[PDB]
């Protein structure tokens, strides 16, 4: 029992784009852009759609960089998050109802105001290493179990 999600990181040589989530799941934290994959679209199409809805941006190419499975205690569906990155974006990022975008220098990523799991796998993202992760949460703050490894194929 798992549900497909996307997460998109716009990662340029010296900065990364994050969005401050304004409502809904994860509100009040910076994150990549993404959301649920809909019936009738591929995972990559859903990632492009969420990037556009949340930031106005389109992209030439998205690259698979990771998969993260989340368990939330008491919730029946695992969240199967497909993580993508891109360097070349099209457009200037703009605020949506869901997200307020901002660029961050790579040594100034705001981990204290991000989901606690990002501290663990962001180093792999920045190192351009593909990964599989699993995080079990009690509520929104406490990681109870986790696993993280590098993989050759996402």
Which parts are annotated binding residues for 2-oxo-dATP? Answer: 6, 31, 33-36, 115-118
Which parts are annotated binding residues for Mg(2+)? Answer: 34, 50, 53-54, 98
Q: Where in the sequence is the domain holding 97, given as residue range(s)?
A: 1-154
How was this entry determined?
X-ray
Which parts are annotated binding residues for O(6)-methyl-dGMP? Answer: 6, 21, 31, 115-118
- Using the Cα atoms of residue 100, residue 18, residue 56 and residue 14 in order, give the sign of their dihedral: positive
In the chain, the number of structural domains is: 1
Give the β-pairing of 2-12 and 78-86. parallel
- Give resolution in angstroms: 1.7
Which parts are annotated binding residues for 8-oxo-dGTP? Answer: 6, 21, 31, 33-36, 115-118
Q: Answer yes or no: are the C-beta atoms of 21 and 11 closer than 8 Å.
A: no
Q: What is the 3-state secondary structure (H, E, C) of the chain?
A: CEEEEEEEEEEECCEEEEEEECCCCCCCCEECEEEECCCCCCHHHHHHHHHHHHHCCEECCCEEEEEEEEEECCCCCEEEEEEEEECCEECCCCCCCCEEEEEEECCCCCHHHECCCHHHHHHHHHCCCCEEEEEEEECCCEEEEEEEEECCCC
Q: How many CB atoms lie within 10 A of CB 3?
A: 14
Which parts are annotated binding residues? Answer: 6, 21, 25, 31, 33-36, 50, 53-54, 98, 115-118
Q: How far is CA 85 from each of CA 22, 31, 122, 130, 145, rounded to the nearest angstrom?
A: 22, 13, 12, 11, 26
Which parts are annotated binding residues for N(6)-methyl-AMP? Answer: 6, 21, 115-118
Q: Which pair of tokens denotes residue 51?
A: 């990037």
């Amino acid at each position: 029992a798992s549900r497909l999600y996307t997460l998109v990181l716009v990662l340029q040589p010296q900065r990364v784009l994050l969005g401050m989530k304004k409502r809904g799941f994860g509100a009040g934290r910076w994150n990549g852009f993404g959301g649920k994959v809909q019936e009738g679209e591929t995972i990559e199409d859903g990632a492009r759609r969420e990037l556009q809805e949340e930031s106005g941006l389109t992209v030439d190419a998205l690259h698979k960089v990771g998969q993260i499975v989340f368990e939330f205690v008491g919730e029946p569906e695992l969240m199967d998050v497909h993580v993508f990155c891109t360097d070349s974006i099209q457009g200037t990022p703009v605020e949506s109802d869901e997200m307020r975008p901002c660029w961050f220098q790579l040594d100034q990523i705001p981990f204290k105001d991000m989901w606690p799991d990002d501290s663990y796998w962001f180093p792999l993202l920045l190192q351009k290493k593909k990964f599989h992760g699993y995080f079990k949460f009690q509520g929104q703050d406490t990681i109870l179990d986790y696993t993280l490894r590098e993989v050759d194929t996402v």
